[PDB]
């Protein structure tokens, strides 16, 4: 509720903005528009680029590196919007910055923002 309070992750609802893997998401959760936690919805294009963050998983006690890739080539879904910024740095430290549209690498040169997925790319240690 208190938007300014420390973020507390949960592991029970992937469409909620407090889902653990969404610790540095900026945009919309793809699961809400036909994609899934780690796959893009039909019709969109999957970028290869991403901003990353280390998110804590409450269920197992570890932290994991999440690579936020965008699904591009469509107007914003408008469903399940969220903006979290755990460990998010300014634009001059792009690897960790989340206002940038991380669509590079998508097919057909797609650069419009539809939603973001939250795949795990490694442990954080």
């Amino acid at each position: 509720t208190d938007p300014r309070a420390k973020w507390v992750p949960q592991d029970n609802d992937i469409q909620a903005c407090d889902y653990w893997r969404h610790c540095s998401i900026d945009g919309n959760i793809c699961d809400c528009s036909g994609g899934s936690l780690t796959n893009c919805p039909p019709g969109t294009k999957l970028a290869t680029a991403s901003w990353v963050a280390s998110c804590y998983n409450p269920t197992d006690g570890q932290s994991y590196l999440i690579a936020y890739r965008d699904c591009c080539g469509y107007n914003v879904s408008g469903r399940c919007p969220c903006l979290n910024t755990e460990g998010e740095l300014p634009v001059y430290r792009p690897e960790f910055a989340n206002d940038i549209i991380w669509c590079f690498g998508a097919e057909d040169d797609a650069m419009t923002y539809h939603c973001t997925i939250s795949p795990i790319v490694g442990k954080a240690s």
Binding site: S33, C40, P42, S77
Partner: protein
Amino acid sequence: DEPRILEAPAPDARRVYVNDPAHFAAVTQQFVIDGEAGRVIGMIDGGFLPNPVVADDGSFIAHASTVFSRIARGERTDYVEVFDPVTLLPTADIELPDAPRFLVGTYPWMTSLTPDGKTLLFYQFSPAPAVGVVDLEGKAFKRMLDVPDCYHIFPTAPDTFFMHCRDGSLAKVAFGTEGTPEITHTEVFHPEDEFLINHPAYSQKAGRLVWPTYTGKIHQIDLSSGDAKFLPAVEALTEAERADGWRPGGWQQVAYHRALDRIYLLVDQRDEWRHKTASRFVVVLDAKTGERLAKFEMGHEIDSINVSQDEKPLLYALSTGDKTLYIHDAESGEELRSVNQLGHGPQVITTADMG
């Protein structure tokens, strides 16, 4: 952990499409929803006031749409796009030169498919009335057909369609791939003081046109013979109800279930000139006899309704103000699930008659 692009589930009787004209915005969206799970399975982007169509056999979906080179000004381009129903990728993009689309709040029957799925017809209002012919199979715009002061397009065959004329008749239009169309008129079927709503229900497979008036009187026309047979009118509200202020009202006010031969109509108590406001009730009636089978209290302000065409159908009730599609059991009227966050001002529900 390996990201990919998903494919939507195969189209089935429970798939439902919701279009969001977004209160006249320059760009719009279409939501593809699995009615069974109550989940969004895909989306499609569209331009200004697009007209959606969906093949009854589930082989494809398409829309007639309009974009501008500078958002809402600059060069205009009208076009048709056809999409695969599982990958959601466009399979054709056909330009309609010379900006012929009629831009109006979305009426489903202003753009329609012939029974074979090979041709798309759309209405032009200005400079003069006409109907454009798009060949989906050949992927090309063929031509404009000149018609009299008539509206809406109900295709009955690969080369024939009906329109409703200002004079109260229906116009039968037989086109015939080169030439000038043979235009025939039926008898006048309604007086000048009966106003037929902008959203009649039409079942192409059944050839049944269900058209209500502002008062709930329902005209039914059977086109299955290739010709119009007028059926006996039916009153959806009783005299006492009307005396009590009951009237239909909404956007897609009526729905028709083919296999059950049943009509669903949105109604509520309202002043006579409040015909576009949402309604909280739905009356269900037998199409053969006019007999009332049920009156459901929907429990929300519903603007549009539609039904699945399967054996035990779902009743879809879309609220523009809540931006949510409520899914109900069409037999009991009970609310099963709901899908929210449907855009800015969702208004049109489309379903396929796959049976």
